Structures are given as C-alpha cells and as structure tokens.
Enzyme design. Sequence first.
Site, PDB file in Angstrom:
ATOM      1  N   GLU A 125      -3.290  42.661  14.021  1.00  0.00           N
ATOM      2  CA  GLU A 125      -3.021  42.867  15.451  1.00  0.00           C
ATOM      3  C   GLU A 125      -1.674  43.567  15.672  1.00  0.00           C
ATOM      4  OE1 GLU A 125      -3.213  38.948  17.393  1.00  0.00           O
ATOM      5  OE2 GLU A 125      -5.303  38.654  16.864  1.00  0.00           O
ATOM      6  N   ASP A 166      -7.684  33.288  18.351  1.00  0.00           N
ATOM      7  CA  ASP A 166      -6.706  32.286  17.941  1.00  0.00           C
ATOM      8  C   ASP A 166      -6.995  30.873  18.450  1.00  0.00           C
ATOM      9  OD1 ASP A 166      -5.485  34.341  16.574  1.00  0.00           O
ATOM     10  OD2 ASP A 166      -3.518  34.069  17.391  1.00  0.00           O
ATOM     11  N   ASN A 197      -3.521  38.100  12.597  1.00  0.00           N
ATOM     12  CA  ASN A 197      -2.475  38.453  13.558  1.00  0.00           C
ATOM     13  C   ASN A 197      -1.472  39.487  13.045  1.00  0.00           C
ATOM     14  OD1 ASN A 197      -3.857  36.554  15.016  1.00  0.00           O
ATOM     15  ND2 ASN A 197      -2.014  35.516  15.766  1.00  0.00           N
ATOM     16  N   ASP A 238       3.755  -7.977  -6.228  1.00  0.00           N
ATOM     17  CA  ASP A 238       3.544  -6.548  -6.147  1.00  0.00           C
ATOM     18  C   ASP A 238       4.369  -5.890  -5.064  1.00  0.00           C
ATOM     19  OD1 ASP A 238       1.596  -6.926  -8.119  1.00  0.00           O
ATOM     20  OD2 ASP A 238       0.035  -7.245  -6.644  1.00  0.00           O
ATOM     21  N   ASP A 275      -1.690  -3.388 -10.280  1.00  0.00           N
ATOM     22  CA  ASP A 275      -1.885  -4.810 -10.589  1.00  0.00           C
ATOM     23  C   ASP A 275      -3.285  -5.032 -11.162  1.00  0.00           C
ATOM     24  OD1 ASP A 275      -1.185  -7.699 -10.496  1.00  0.00           O
ATOM     25  OD2 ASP A 275      -2.782  -7.834  -9.072  1.00  0.00           O
ATOM     26  N   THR A 290      -4.942  -8.683 -11.637  1.00  0.00           N
ATOM     27  CA  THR A 290      -5.658  -9.867 -11.158  1.00  0.00           C
ATOM     28  C   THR A 290      -5.842  -9.785  -9.652  1.00  0.00           C
ATOM     29  OG1 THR A 290      -4.326 -11.065 -12.801  1.00  0.00           O
ATOM     30  CG2 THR A 290      -5.906 -12.318 -11.592  1.00  0.00           C
ATOM     31  N   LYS A 300       7.585  -4.285 -12.366  1.00  0.00           N
ATOM     32  CA  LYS A 300       6.562  -3.439 -11.763  1.00  0.00           C
ATOM     33  C   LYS A 300       7.297  -2.321 -11.036  1.00  0.00           C
ATOM     34  CE  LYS A 300       2.505  -6.449 -11.519  1.00  0.00           C
ATOM     35  NZ  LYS A 300       1.744  -7.548 -10.840  1.00  0.00           N
ATOM     36  N   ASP A 331      -2.203  -7.066  -4.710  1.00  0.00           N
ATOM     37  CA  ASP A 331      -2.711  -8.123  -3.843  1.00  0.00           C
ATOM     38  C   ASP A 331      -1.680  -9.223  -3.613  1.00  0.00           C
ATOM     39  OD1 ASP A 331      -3.797 -10.645  -5.931  1.00  0.00           O
ATOM     40  OD2 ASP A 331      -3.226  -8.825  -6.812  1.00  0.00           O
ATOM     41  N   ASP A 386      -0.364 -11.066 -16.616  1.00  0.00           N
ATOM     42  CA  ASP A 386      -1.212 -11.680 -17.608  1.00  0.00           C
ATOM     43  C   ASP A 386      -0.893 -11.205 -19.015  1.00  0.00           C
ATOM     44  OD1 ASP A 386      -4.759 -12.592 -17.161  1.00  0.00           O
ATOM     45  OD2 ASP A 386      -3.211 -13.581 -18.338  1.00  0.00           O
ATOM     46  N   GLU A 446      -5.742 -21.230  -9.545  1.00  0.00           N
ATOM     47  CA  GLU A 446      -5.562 -22.642  -9.204  1.00  0.00           C
ATOM     48  C   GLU A 446      -6.833 -23.239  -8.667  1.00  0.00           C
ATOM     49  OE1 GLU A 446      -2.153 -23.489  -6.795  1.00  0.00           O
ATOM     50  OE2 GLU A 446      -1.078 -24.112  -8.661  1.00  0.00           O
TER      51      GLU A 446
HETATM   52  N1  ADP Z   1      -0.174 -21.439 -10.256  1.00  0.00           N
HETATM   53  C1  ADP Z   1       0.170 -21.232 -11.541  1.00  0.00           C
HETATM   54  N2  ADP Z   1       0.682 -22.234 -12.267  1.00  0.00           N
HETATM   55  C2  ADP Z   1       0.997 -21.997 -13.553  1.00  0.00           C
HETATM   56  N3  ADP Z   1       0.830 -20.815 -14.195  1.00  0.00           N
HETATM   57  C3  ADP Z   1       0.315 -19.738 -13.562  1.00  0.00           C
HETATM   58  C4  ADP Z   1      -0.059 -19.910 -12.166  1.00  0.00           C
HETATM   59  N4  ADP Z   1      -0.547 -18.721 -11.782  1.00  0.00           N
HETATM   60  C5  ADP Z   1      -0.470 -17.857 -12.815  1.00  0.00           C
HETATM   61  N5  ADP Z   1       0.033 -18.477 -13.868  1.00  0.00           N
HETATM   62  C6  ADP Z   1       0.294 -17.855 -15.162  1.00  0.00           C
HETATM   63  O1  ADP Z   1       1.451 -17.025 -14.931  1.00  0.00           O
HETATM   64  C7  ADP Z   1       1.163 -15.697 -15.354  1.00  0.00           C
HETATM   65  C8  ADP Z   1       1.908 -14.728 -14.455  1.00  0.00           C
HETATM   66  O2  ADP Z   1       1.201 -14.552 -13.223  1.00  0.00           O
HETATM   67  P1  ADP Z   1       1.533 -13.276 -12.303  1.00  0.00           P
HETATM   68  O3  ADP Z   1       2.939 -12.837 -12.700  1.00  0.00           O
HETATM   69  O4  ADP Z   1       1.273 -13.550 -10.838  1.00  0.00           O
HETATM   70  O5  ADP Z   1       0.508 -12.208 -12.965  1.00  0.00           O
HETATM   71  P2  ADP Z   1      -1.095 -12.396 -13.017  1.00  0.00           P
HETATM   72  O6  ADP Z   1      -1.424 -13.388 -11.933  1.00  0.00           O
HETATM   73  O7  ADP Z   1      -1.762 -11.077 -12.686  1.00  0.00           O
HETATM   74  O8  ADP Z   1      -1.288 -12.861 -14.441  1.00  0.00           O
HETATM   75  C9  ADP Z   1      -0.379 -15.601 -15.361  1.00  0.00           C
HETATM   76  O9  ADP Z   1      -0.892 -14.635 -16.288  1.00  0.00           O
HETATM   77  C10 ADP Z   1      -0.844 -17.009 -15.688  1.00  0.00           C
HETATM   78  O10 ADP Z   1      -0.857 -17.225 -17.097  1.00  0.00           O
HETATM   79  F1  ALF Z   2      -2.174  -8.686 -12.586  1.00  0.00           F
HETATM   80 AL1  ALF Z   2      -1.212  -9.588 -11.394  1.00  0.00          AL
HETATM   81  F2  ALF Z   2      -0.110 -10.449 -10.284  1.00  0.00           F
HETATM   82  F3  ALF Z   2      -2.614  -9.910 -10.327  1.00  0.00           F
HETATM   83  F4  ALF Z   2       0.147  -9.133 -12.426  1.00  0.00           F
HETATM   84 CA    CA Z   3      -1.882  33.462  19.051  1.00  0.00          CA
HETATM   85 CA    CA Z   4      -5.611  36.525  16.513  1.00  0.00          CA
HETATM   86 MG    MG Z   5      -2.888  -9.984  -8.488  1.00  0.00          MG
HETATM   87 MG    MG Z   6      -0.951 -13.017  -9.787  1.00  0.00          MG
END
Ligand code: ADP
Ligand code: ALF
Ligand code: CA
Ligand code: CA
Ligand code: MG
Ligand code: MG
Length: 994
Positions: free
Chosen positions: A771, A800, A768, A707, A351, A353, A684, A703, A627, A442
């Site tokens: 031996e 031993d 051994n 995943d 992963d 992020t 994944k 994380d 991402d 967020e």
């Molecule tokens: N809370 C959210 N609300 C809307 N869009 C989101 C939110 N969190 C992540 N995203 C978007 O959704 C995509 C997919 O997220 P995710 O599948 O968890 O992979 P990552 O977090 O590693 O990008 C992110 O790249 C981001 O553009």
């Molecule tokens: F890179 Al991520 F959920 F953190 F796809």
């Molecule tokens: Ca032995």
């Molecule tokens: Ca021995």
């Molecule tokens: Mg992540």
């Molecule tokens: Mg994520």
Amino acid sequence: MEAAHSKSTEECLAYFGVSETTGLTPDQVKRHLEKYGHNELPAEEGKSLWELVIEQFEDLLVRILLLAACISFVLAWFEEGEETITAFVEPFVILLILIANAIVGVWQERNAENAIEALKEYEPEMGKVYRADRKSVQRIKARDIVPGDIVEVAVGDKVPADIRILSIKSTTLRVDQSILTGESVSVIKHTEPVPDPRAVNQDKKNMLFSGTNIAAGKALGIVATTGVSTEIGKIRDQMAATEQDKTPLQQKLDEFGEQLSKVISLICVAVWLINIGHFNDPVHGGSWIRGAIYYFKIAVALAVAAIPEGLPAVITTCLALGTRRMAKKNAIVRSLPSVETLGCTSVICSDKTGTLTTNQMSVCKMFIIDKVDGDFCSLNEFSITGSTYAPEGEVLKNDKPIRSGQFDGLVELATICALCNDSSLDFNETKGVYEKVGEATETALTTLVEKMNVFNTEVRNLSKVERANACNSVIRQLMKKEFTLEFSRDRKSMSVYCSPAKSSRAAVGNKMFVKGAPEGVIDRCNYVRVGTTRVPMTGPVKEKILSVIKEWGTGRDTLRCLALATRDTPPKREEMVLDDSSRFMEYETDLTFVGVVGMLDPPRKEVMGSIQLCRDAGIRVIMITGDNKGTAIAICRRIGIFGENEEVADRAYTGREFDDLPLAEQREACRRACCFARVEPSHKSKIVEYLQSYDEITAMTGDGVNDAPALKKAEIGIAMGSGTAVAKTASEMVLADDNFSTIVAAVEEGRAIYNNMKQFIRYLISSNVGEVVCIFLTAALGLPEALIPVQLLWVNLVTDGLPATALGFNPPDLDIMDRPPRSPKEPLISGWLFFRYMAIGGYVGAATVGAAAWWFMYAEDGPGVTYHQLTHFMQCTEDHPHFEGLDCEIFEAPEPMTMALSVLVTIEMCNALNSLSENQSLMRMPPWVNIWLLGSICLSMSLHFLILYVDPLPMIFKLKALDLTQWLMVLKISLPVIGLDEILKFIARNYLEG
Ligand SMILES: Nc1ncnc2c1ncn2[C@@H]1O[C@H](COP(=O)(O)OP(=O)(O)O)[C@@H](O)[C@H]1O
Ligand code: ALF
Ligand SMILES: [Ca+2]
Ligand SMILES: [Ca+2]
Ligand SMILES: [Mg+2]
Ligand SMILES: [Mg+2]
Ligand SMILES: [K+]
C-alpha cells in the site's frame, strides 16, 4: 456469629452450646442455617461492565485511528475536504474497523469469563467438621458450615471459615494469611485469649481466617463467623486493582507497535514532503493552502492504512481464546502469561506422589519379623486385598486368610498405624464411597487397620459410616495420645507420644509410636521386635529387612514403603522440648523396629503419553520426589522417563548424592538427570533454579506443600485439582481434572498463539508495505495518483479488519509440536521474514501501480497512451506540450484509480490466504482450515462490490469497473501473490532454519 477472639475456648463452646469433641447436632445445624444463612459470599457477580470491556480502546494504536477520525470530522465541518459529503464518510470508514475488532474482542472476553466461571464453580469446596451425627470427622460442602461447628484443618488446607482455635494438634500451627494481611511469611498461632476487642487481624493469633492457608500443623476450631461476616468477606468489593499489567509477549508486541508508529510517522511526513510540489496544481485551484491540506489528508489516510489498528485486539483475543480452550480442558488459568510461557517451555519438573501417580494409595503388602537366630533372619510377609480406601478386604498369609490378632507383631503394627496418624476415613453417603481425610499415605494405613481388625472387634453389624473408623477407634481407646511430633521432611518421619488409656496402671510404660521413610527409621532402631520379644538390631537383620524393601519398591507393583517402629522407653516429657522441630529426630531414637507396609499407588493413565509428546516437542521431564530412589526410578521406567533398561547411574540422584556434589556439578547434574529422589522442598526449588540458569523456561508440577517453593520459582506453576490449596495458591495453572495431558495441550496452545500472532503480523506488514510501496512508486516514477484519501481508508477498512483478526483463529500448524521450543529472547522478527515482507510488499506495490498503468496504456476502453506514459502529465488544459493532444483530462478518470483499489483489495485478500501458516503450502494447509478467514474475506469482497455497483456509492468513492473483463485483469495481476509466497515458503521449508 461471635464478636470475640477475646473470649476463652470454653466461652465460645458455651456460647453455641456445643460439645467440643462431638460438634453440632442436626437440629443445631438446622437452626444455624436459618439464623445465619449458608457460608458463602453472594457476590460471584459482575467482573466487567459491558462498558468496561468496550473501553479496550485506550490502546497504543487504536488511539491514533481515534484521533485520525477527529481531523476528518473537523476538515469535513469546514464545508470541504475535496468533495462535499465525501468528508463525512471518512470518519465512519475509520470507526467502522475499530467497532468490528472491538465487538470481537469483547465477545471473546465475555465467552472466556463465562467458561472460566463454569469451571471454577464446578467442583464444590469441602470442609471437615465434627458433628454429633458421626463420631469421626466428616466432610461437608464448606457452603453448609455455620457458626458453632467444630472444624478441623491441617497443613495444605484452605481455612473454610473464620475460626476460633480450640486445640492445636501439632507442636506448632503456621498460617499463610498473606491474602488478608499482606504478611508474606507464615505466622504462629496459639489458643489463648486475646483480650482487645479493638485488635487488628495481625494480633488475632488464636483465630484462622477464611481464605488463608495452613502452612504447617493441624488444629481444631469452632467457627465464629461465616459468609459475608467473614473478615475477608467484608473487604471484597474494595481494592485498587490488585489486578495487573500485561503479559511479556503482549509487552513485546506493544513495543513492536510503538516503533512501528515511529516508521509510519516518517513515511507519512515524507509523503507530505515528497509532494506539495503538486500543491499549486489546477486540481485544488492552485491555492497556497488547499493542496497542503489535501496531501496532509493523503498522509493521515496513509497512516490509518499502514497502522495495524487490530493488533491490540488480536492478542487480547488469542489470549482470551487460549483461556477459553484451557477451561474446556478443565484447566484454570490463574495468571494470563501461563499459556504463552508454557508455550516455550523446555523443561517440566514434576513431583511424583499424587501428581504423576493417582494418589489412590492401598496397602497391599506388609511384613514383620519371624525368626532371628545369628546370621539367619526371616520375615512374616502378608498380602492385603482391596485397592480402594474401603475397609473391605482380607489379610493373606500363604494364600490363606488370617486373623491378624494371631500375630503380636501385627497387633503392634496395627497399633502404630492407627495412633501415629493425622488422617481418617469418611464414607460418602451420596457418592456411596469411602473417602480420605488428610493425606493418602496416612489414610491407606487407616484403611489397613480396619482390614486387620486385630482385636477381633465386632464390625459386621455396623453402618458403612461406622465401619469406616471402628477398629481404629478401638485402638485409640487402648492408649492416650499425649502429643504428636508432626511429620517433617528432613527426618522423613513422624512420632506420637502415648500413655495407657484408663490410667489403669500408671508407669507400666509410655511409648512413642513411629512411622517414616524406611531408611532413616531403620537407622534409628537399635532393636527389632519378634512377636512380643525384643532383640538387638544386627547387620544380617537390617540387610534382610532392607532387601525386601528394595524388592517391593523396585518390583512390578512399585510399592511405596513405610517402616514402623516403637520407642519402648521414651524420654520423660519434661526432658522433651517441643518448641524446636529439630530435636524431634533425637527423640525418635533407640527405636524398636516393628515392620513395613508397601503401598500401591498407580501412575495416571495419561502420563506416559504426555511424556512422549514432550520428547517430540523437544521438552524434558524431570521427576522430583521425596520418595525412595528405588521406587522413583522404577516408576520413571513405568512412565517412560527411563527406558526399562538403562544405566541411570549418572542421571538419577538422591538428595544426599546431589548435595555431596560441588555446586558446579549440581548445576550440570540438573542438565542430564531426570530423577531426583529423597529430596527436601528446598531441593525442588534449587533444581528449578539450576535449570533457569541455562536461561530456560521451567515448569513445576505438584500437589503438596513441599512443592510450593518450586511451584513459585518456576516460570509456570501447575497445581493438581486433587492437591493442596497451598500448592494451588503458588500456581499459575490448576488441573481440576488432575489430567496431565492438559499440560501438553497448554504447551501446544501457547505455541499456536505465538504462531497466530506471527501470521497476523506477516499479513499486515507485507500487505500494508505494498500500500505504501504503491504511493511512492507512482510519485517517483512520475505517474498520476492511484488513490485518494477515502480510497485509502477503504482498503484499510476492508483489508485490515476481519481478514486480519481472523488469522487469530488459525488452526495449529501441522508441525507445531515437532520443533523444539522457541527461546523467549528470540528476535520477534526474523531477518529472513523481514525480507519476505518486502518481497510480498514489493509485488503488491508494483501490481497495483502496474494495474492503473495498464488501464491507461494497454486497455481497450482506456486511452491507448502506449509505452512511455507518453512521457509526462504536463498536458493540463487544451492541447499541450503537444504530445498526441488527443485526449484531455483522462487523468482524474476514476477508471485507473478504481482499477488499483480493486487490485489492492483483491491481492491483499490473496496473501491473507498465505498467512494460514508460516511455511506450509496451501496444498497441505488449504483455505478451508480457517473458515472464519474465508467469511471475513467474502464480507470484504462483498463490501467492495456494494461500493462499486449501488449507484450513490461509486460517486462518493469513484466510478465503477467493467465487471466482465476489468475484474479478470485485477484477478490476473493479484493471484500470483499466492504463487510468490508459495515459492518463498518452499525456500524456507526445503532449505531450513529457525
Ligand atoms: N505422614 C507421614 N508420616 C511419616 N512418614 C511419611 C509421612 N508421609 C510421607 N512419609 C515419608 O516421608 C517421605 C517424604 O515425603 P514427601 O517429602 O512429602 O515426598 P513424597 O510424599 O512424594 O514421598 C515419603 O517418601 C514417605 O516415606
Ligand atoms: F513425590 Al512428592 F511430595 F508427592 F515428593
Ligand atoms: Ca490499518
Ligand atoms: Ca491493509
Ligand atoms: Mg505429592
Ligand atoms: Mg508428599
Ligand atoms: K511460578
């Protein structure tokens, strides 16, 4: 305390006298602590009884030696053996080595559990609550929560306490409560009463149990029970070991020891057969029972000898020791095999992020539309200072600080960020720092809005606690949040349905506010907001918007981007069906584009390094992230997965690009590609499966809840300390550190445990074998016996034991992390090593027979029997087949025998020095790399001197050996074993294979 899930939300609230949105007062919390205690289970204690751990007898080969000690206790009991008291020593020469290894194993296990419990207890578990002293949700040590506070929990979270659900914030709430019910798939909850006081947990669909995990959604609850009263708290003491069978490599060596029991049995019965021709000889008075028991004693003593009695302990130990070191690097091993398996890992999927990056998100760039006029399109861009989640920083346009409320476009931007958000900020009074609640992406938005302060709200006069969510709250007053379409990774966006706030003007319009991955969101925009204006989306505009995203994502800050949009005319709620998460996307259409935010999210320091080490260790690293492909590739470069310039066209893929390919080609893409982007949780998993289809050992790092599938599928699942409880649950290892380096360390350690196991085996077998070679080389070549049953038990006690167990503390080989991973199905014993065991075994067998012969034939204190053994033993009584009937009995002389026993020990102790390393030279890996070994050796040599020179002892064994010169000989014969292996290592090194 609340007996009921079968009472309404209201009733529970009223039971504790709590305002649902505000939560308990300080004085309510003061009482509830006193009345109910802290939310924790006292237990924590006793995982193994000093005794329990002592009972790591019970093993494969230790039970053999255990038996062997009984027969020696019984054969002694019938007045004999051969000598009278020499038979009551026998049992203690066998138990002794057993006790020694037992003590070490037990010690290492105790040290391991301690170290582990130090790590686990280190970082305190936190919960999120509304309490009266703060308007926004705040985070407290779960330990402090009491019945009756309002608790918030969302996807990823471990439920901190047994809770009655009050309000579900998403269209659905799904919980993984396997740990309690066995229920393996996640399960739906509601907030309606469940009348039956009798009803089983499975039917408590409006409750959330401490220790379960939220798989999907967000909810608000009130705590019914805590600590021991907790549904899970009641049942702890009990279970028939949901504990477990041993590790693959443990089962391998076990199988290897099982079939070494076969071979030794045969050579043992063989000794008893090859002899018993000598079962009428003058020595036991020629009885037709006595010398059959004697040679039976030679067999058993030889079995105890040959058997690697310490093999079960040394693995147990190297394991516990591996854990103890991982714990010292803040890695929690949830499952023993994790270090050995990680040892032969060829691929580490990861992963991005929060895993490869720090997940400390900051919004530093944003833009809205400025001018749209035909093929011309222009953006108002902006910069934002402050890297941290602290509301301190400013918006800059053209290097000058602005008042964001100046720009209607930014007002809406701020509005969406605020409203379309399940996260918030909390200020840590102790640490003195603004901390996120819910997801970083967020939360970054949250801290952004506070900085933008679009309604010019007065915040200079507020506590650091109040300042955290002030501007956001202001917006929250401006619009009512009917409901939310939870973020889901298929559409890669999230929605929120709102109506105006006072109900001041009914039907001036509801709105949906949308935020998401920019490509999908922008595709679902038919309009483009220009200040307070709206105009049709067009090609030139889209091209503009997108290019500046490409810019920021691919640039040197590698910004993580999110698009923001409003749906100006939503559906009527009645036309909207919330039950089906797959209609959410259509609901999110006919959008107006408002703007974009770009987020800073730095790669962790340690990462690039670790990756380099994986390269050298022959290990591949693949990034797998939801991402954007732009930013994901950019980051791979910054991390060193890709060099700063490389056509990547053939080895980075989106989800779509990947799915576009035929299965055959998907599998193959996995073999060359290192970067997978815009990819769902199923992908994944699939990528990991693909790697596993090359019969390779795959690790997943992550994380987030997206995943878990891959974390589960992989051989080793490694979860971030910082990450979700669900990711952690699906894992074998957890970096509490969030320190990626430990992964590499863990690889190195598993590699080393393997190599330590190897050296132990080499040391025992080769020695051994000698031996045994020894006894058969006398009996065949037709010499006087070289050893006796107790003399065999002595070399065993002293070769031993700790010199062997010690090898487990060998240091890592010098090249350990420079050869590729071992395939897991490789022959445990290499054809070539088997040879080396015999080379050494042979020299040892011949060096010890050659020693007794040298006492007889060449030695000045020995009779001068000269070459040809004088040709037999027949001589017997006074002057026979008269062949220099000069000396009578000299056979049975302790001198020749105690000569051999001293070459055997001394030489065995020598090729333990060869067993510091498979193929490294004592010149490059000297003896002082392992001190533990050197100590053990002194203890043996030391024990072996005692037995010789403290005057009652030599009788029980045999007469002593002329210090000054006999030892010089023993040492002359034994030292070359080193010179031999060292040529043999020269071979395997300067020719090579493996
Ligand atoms: N809370 C959210 N609300 C809307 N869009 C989101 C939110 N969190 C992540 N995203 C978007 O959704 C995509 C997919 O997220 P995710 O599948 O968890 O992979 P990552 O977090 O590693 O990008 C992110 O790249 C981001 O553009
Ligand atoms: F890179 Al991520 F959920 F953190 F796809
Ligand atoms: Ca032995
Ligand atoms: Ca021995
Ligand atoms: Mg992540
Ligand atoms: Mg994520
Ligand atoms: K796994």
